[PDB]
Design a protein around this ligand. Structure first.
Ligand SMILES: Nc1ncnc2c1ncn2[C@@H]1O[C@H](COP(=O)(O)OP(=O)(O)OP(=O)(O)O)[C@@H](O)[C@H]1O
Ligand SMILES: Nc1ncnc2c1ncn2[C@@H]1O[C@H](COP(=O)(O)OP(=O)(O)OP(=O)(O)O)[C@@H](O)[C@H]1O
Ligand SMILES: Nc1ncnc2c1ncn2[C@@H]1O[C@H](COP(=O)(O)OP(=O)(O)O)[C@@H](O)[C@H]1O
Lengths: 743, 225, 261
């Protein structure tokens, strides 16, 4: 039937148009600019404009939030679309905005909003429709309550508006339709996708699902840093799906009145059960249900057990879903981890630079910034921040710009607001000052992501790269050969060789190439974890790696354990042995299903305990030879990007003079040369300033700053300190150890 | 509580005069010069014998005395939380149609009271319009400030017993119920199915004042393109 | 309109200084030491002496606490300054000490306080004003309740001063002095500026930033050694900016019996 068409999100940003695929326009006989009467629920009829967009599938009609509000429907609904081009030019429209816009403005929406929005717009208008216009800061809503002719009219020169009168309140159900939606979230594609996938079907078709006879999931927990928008996520999902979201705060529950809390708790549970499929949200469960041995009194135990009983007694019953928010899964009582109880857990990681840019773009929407905004490096430098931090930064920058406008000598009591709001811009100095007044909350916390180092970045030992990619990419991409032949692929590979050879560089490069998550573990942190906090840290780090499959776990200072094992300390040996035993047991505990690889690196392989070098354990071992000439020239040309390239000389003879030197030596030499170049530029600029101040207008001819020519003299003053970073005899010791292995 | 004062003061002149008369007929009738016994509403008496004293005055009879005056108080109290809802509920945006529908319903109820020979008229009308109003407001619990144990499905017969214990001839209120049913018929069933003659007429007196009936769109601004 | 001036914090602590830049002196062609008329909120009237200060901007007026209270106004408001050259030398002044300002003195106010402060000052005074005088080790307020001419007049050598009688009953909106101010804090200029910058705007303009719709901060922590003046800082800010300071103490809460706390 060419009537119904299921709805979908719109990619077009225009309010009064929708995206149509070519076969649908051909079948319905509609063209560009033709008005169509979408008939939905509640006897709601809307006039929209057809646009050509084959991106949308035939069965799905792209349709954004404003049209959804006008049609009074949700996603996945059914709406009949039919031709209806008989709209007539209008004469008058009496329109009243939302009442929640005169909050200290008292302006005229006709010029500030209506003129920018409807300049040569030719939008179609119907009685009672709801739309939005973004302004300086407020996305002001507007409802037309009278039109002539009724109900169809189009934006046209022959239009007179009656925008006079106290603005009406929001239209009942639309009160919550002011904000909160899927568009309001950034950097959470996978998590949101999972949540939608496993929540939509039970909620959209509860009766159908119950008639099928499949149990619905009931335990969903989310853990992450505070301020990551977990409550925002829950609210958005509940608002989108359609339910009776009933927030329950944490702290107040304990301190209401002695032991009356469970009364209110069960009252809330009952009324939620009384009010159709609803989502019941609980926050900071640790404040309610901490670890059992943390508990001091008894009333908290009573509350915890009451909650257990209440949530366990809701098996089937109604289509009510429990939403839980917390920070750390460990702090919660494990008793709330059984099946039927909370069973599905989601981590909310810190967004990356792209996620930070997305969040800023979401926040930086109403305000009109100046035409200099460069959010890219701003996001890059602002790692370690959350959505709350970026929102605070945006608000602070807005206030700084406001005060940079200065209080322009007025008693600003609804007198200058309209003039200021429509005339604003945001300077980069505002963002600089915000960066100065910035206190990231994450700071000292691990981050898992895909590194950036590429193969060409290394420039050397392509044989090792070939072997690594052979051992890594082939099994996951070609499991058919392995199952046909029947061998278990290796899981751990060790690296040994002279220090300063970029073993971590290779690890990052292979992780980036594999497009998998990366985790770095530092030896000092391990040695800190030796005393006391060892077991839980190992368990949580391996679990975090496991849930992020596929990923490449990495280790550093793998010989530090043995370095402290034998020496003049003799203190952490028991703790070290415990840690290494835990690591060995847990890595023995992994299942081959999880496509997570492990990489260990060291420069003193002899001192390593043989138990690590065992089947199942780290068995594949790779030596890293020192760079030489081709490798030296390659690393030189890979590190020599900079802005001041000058014209340089032959890299081959530079490698020749520095034979038997690691890449660290070359990098240090380059940095020292750059330091001398900076010193020369600084002293020359200072001398030029001195001759300007002693001789006014001495250099009236506009000559640029001294050229950043890093000349061979700079190279000479660089490799004056031609460092023999690596010892000589130890190279023979390492190759002798390798040959001892090379039986 | 004593929030009725703001409600009364906020009312405009014409509507406040209407409601002031509607509620103050008994206190006016208690002037002391004329006994309430002279308004017993005997249609047979006026039809057959002279009964000059009850041309239309018998249609607004409410006995209130020394032992009922305090009870009189709570009576008007009900009317307050009646009118406040009744004006807001059902018909709220039709001031002229308000008077029209009151007039037609009063004609119907006075006709059916002419059929009978009972005594009270305004209480049956009030309860009739009450039930026809609440039939569109059923299945709702409302509790006032000084009340926390208000149960369900008890109010109508409790009030029935309240008016039963003080006085008698209960069946009269039923006739009031009757017109409400007809009035219910008059928004859900009358003007689409029967198609017969209409006994109601709307005089031009209502259209002469037209109390609010505001529909102008203030003023308009030239747009252009 | 370079005649209305926005009042702000001042530098000179003298009781009879309004600080104007030299272009402002050129604008009105005023003399130095002449009396000028000040009009402000609460329909108050003041008389003061113009002094030179290049630190203030052209639109800025710098003027201390005493005369600012004489107009019953705080910093950040707008006042009107006009020439008042028609002032003439006073004849008699009857002042009356405040009730809670002269306790435990038992001395001749003429030869300790009145004589030095009023000497070679020529401070114009208007009926209803209050002026503070430094003494031996206390500072005492006096309210000029009668003067010739009335209400405005010039303190002159040919003035007889009468300060005898029952102390005047305390006023209500007089904004009594001897309270803590910004000057009363030393050694913390940096932090004082930091806190002033990000607290004054929301309080002074409760609706302006609401119209901007930017969330203000709600909680600020101050930490350091005890007795360093944190309470002093809070009280001074509340007194200066103008607010409804409400102090609550933890031990008071702990002293109660649980629930009522
Ligand atoms: N993903 C996000 N997208 C946009 N804004 C965000 C996001 N996360 C946080 N914010 C900002 O922070 C506010 C919500 O932060 P909030 O502190 O409520 O985080 P939460 O994770 O929901 O829970 P909690 O209050 O326990 O930290 C939002 O109104 C917005 O300003
Ligand atoms: N900069 C300062 N200028 C003047 N007086 C000061 C200064 N710093 C401290 N004082 C004095 O030190 C004392 C501090 O008083 P108060 O107890 O109110 O301060 P605090 O630092 O807020 O105290 P608390 O120990 O309760 O935190 C007062 O007598 C005050 O006058
Ligand atoms: N493009 C590159 N190719 C090879 N090695 C590099 C490159 N860039 C940096 N390096 C090396 O990476 C090393 C990092 O040193 P460090 O992390 O201390 O030990 P390790 O080299 O064992 O990781 C530096 O010594 C540097 O020589």
């Amino acid at each position: 039937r060419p009537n119904r068409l299921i709805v979908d999100e719109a990619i077009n940003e225009d309010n009064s148009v929708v995206s149509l695929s070519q076969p649908k326009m051909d079948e319905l006989q509609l063209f560009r600019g033709d008005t169509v009467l979408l008939k939905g629920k509640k006897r709601r009829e809307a006039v929209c404009i057809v646009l050509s967009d084959d991106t949308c599938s035939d069965e799905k009609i792209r349709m954004n939030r404003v049209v959804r509000n006008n049609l009074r429907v949700r996603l996945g609904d059914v709406i009949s679309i039919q031709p209806c081009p008989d709209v007539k030019y209008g004469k008058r429209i009496h329109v009243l905005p939302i009442d929640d816009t005169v909050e200290g403005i008292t302006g005229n929406l006709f010029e500030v909003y209506l003129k920018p929005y409807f300049l040569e717009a030719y939008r179609p208008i119907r009685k009672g429709d709801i739309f939005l216009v973004r302004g300086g800061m407020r996305a002001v809503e507007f409802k037309v309550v009278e039109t002539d002719p009724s109900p169809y009219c189009i934006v046209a020169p022959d239009t007179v508006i009656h925008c006079e009168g106290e603005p009406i309140k929001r239209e009942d159900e639309e009160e919550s339709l002011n904000e909160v939606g899927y568009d309001d979230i950034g950097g959470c594609r996978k998590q949101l996708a999972q949540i939608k996938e496993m929540v939509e079907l039970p909620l959209r078709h509860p009766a159908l699902f119950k008639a099928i006879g499949v149990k619905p999931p009931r335990g969903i927990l989310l853990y992450g840093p505070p301020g990551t928008g977990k409550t925002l996520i829950a609210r958005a999902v509940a608002n989108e799906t359609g339910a009776f979201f009933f927030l329950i705060n944490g702290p107040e529950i304990m301190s209401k009145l002695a032991g009356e809390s469970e009364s209110n708790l069960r009252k809330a549970f009952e009324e939620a059960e009384k009010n159709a499929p609803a989502i019941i949200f609980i926050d900071e469960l640790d404040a309610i249900a901490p670890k059992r041995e943390k508990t001091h009194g008894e009333v908290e135990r009573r509350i915890v057990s009451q909650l257990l009983t209440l949530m366990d007694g809701l098996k089937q019953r109604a289509h009510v879903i429990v939403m839980a928010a917390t920070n750390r899964p460990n702090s919660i009582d494990p008793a709330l981890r059984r099946f039927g109880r909370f069973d599905r857990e989601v981590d909310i990681g810190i967004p990356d630079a792209t996620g930070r840019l997305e969040i800023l773009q979401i926040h930086t929407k109403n305000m009109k910034l100046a035409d200099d905004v460069d959010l890219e490096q701003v996001a890059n430098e602002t790692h370690g921040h959350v959505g709350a931090d970026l929102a605070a930064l945006c608000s602070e920058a807005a206030l700084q710009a406001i005060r940079k406008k200065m209080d322009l000598i007025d008693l600003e009591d609804e007198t200058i607001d309209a003039e200021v709001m429509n005339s604003l811009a945001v300077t980069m100095d505002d963002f600089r000052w915000a960066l100065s007044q910035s206190n990231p909350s994450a700071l000292r916390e691990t981050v898992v992501e895909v590194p950036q180092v590429t193969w060409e970045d290394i420039g050397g030992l392509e044989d090792v790269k070939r072997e690594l990619q052979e051992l890594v990419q082939y099994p996951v991409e070609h499991p058919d050969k392995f199952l046909k032949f029947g061998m278990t692929p290796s899981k751990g590979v060790l690296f040994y060789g002279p220090p300063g050879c970029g073993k971590t560089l290779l690890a990052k490069a292979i992780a980036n190439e594999c497009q998998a998550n990366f985790i770095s573990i530092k030896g000092p942190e391990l040695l800190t974890m030796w005393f006391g906090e060892s077991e839980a840290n190992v368990r949580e780090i391996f679990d975090k790696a496991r849930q992020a499959a596929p990923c490449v776990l990495f280790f550093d200072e793998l010989d530090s354990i043995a370095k402290a094992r034998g020496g003049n300390i003799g203190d952490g040996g028991g703790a070290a042995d415990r840690v290494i035993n835990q690591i060995l047991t847990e890595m023995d505990g992994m299942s081959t299903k999880k496509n997570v690889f492990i990489i260990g690196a060291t420069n003193r392989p002899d001192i390593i305990d043989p138990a690590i070098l065992r089947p199942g354990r780290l068995d594949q071992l790779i030596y890293i030879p020192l760079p030489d000439e081709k490798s030296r020239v390659a690393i030189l040309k890979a590190n020599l990007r900079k802005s001041p390239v000058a014209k340089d000389v032959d890299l081959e003879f530079l490698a020749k003079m520095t034979n038997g030197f690691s890449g660290a030596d070359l990098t240090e030499i380059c940095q020292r040369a750059c330091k001398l170049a900076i010193r020369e530029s600084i002293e020359s600029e200072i001398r030029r300033e001195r001759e300007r101040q002693t001789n006014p207008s001495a250099m009236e001819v506009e000559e640029d700053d001294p050229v950043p020519e890093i000349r061979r003299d700079h190279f000479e003053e660089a490799m004056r300190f031609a460092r023999r970073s690596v010892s000589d005899n130890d190279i023979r010791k390492y190759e002798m150890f390798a040959q001892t292995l090379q039986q | 509580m004593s929030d009725i004062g703001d409600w009364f003061r906020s009312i405009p002149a014409i509507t406040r005069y209407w409601f002031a008369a509607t509620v103050a007929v008994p206190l006016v009738g208690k002037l002391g010069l004329i006994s309430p016994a002279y308004l017993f509403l005997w249609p047979e008496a006026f039809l057959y014998r002279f009964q000059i004293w009850r041309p239309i005055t018998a249609t607004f009879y409410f006995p209130v005395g020394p032992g009922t005056g305090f009870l009189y108080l709570v009576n008007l109290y009900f009317l307050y939380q009646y009118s406040t809802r009744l004006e807001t509920g059902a018909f709220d945006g039709r001031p002229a149609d308000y008077l029209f529908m009151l007039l037609f319903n009063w004609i119907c109820i006075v006709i059916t009271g002419l059929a009978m020979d009972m005594q009270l008229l305004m209480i049956p009308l009030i309860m009739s319009v009450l039930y026809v109003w609440a039939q569109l407001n059923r299945d709702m619990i409302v509790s006032f400030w000084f009340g926390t144990r208000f149960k369900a499905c008890y109010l109508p017969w409790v009030i029935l017993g309240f008016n039963y214990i003080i006085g008698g001839s209960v069946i009269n209120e039923l006739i009031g119920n009757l017109v409400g049913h007809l009035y219910f018929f008059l928004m859900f069933r009358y003007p689409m199915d029967l198609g017969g003659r209409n006994f109601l007429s709307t005089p031009q007196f209502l259209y002469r004042w037209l109390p609010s009936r505001r529909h102008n769109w203030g003023q308009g601004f030239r747009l252009g393109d």
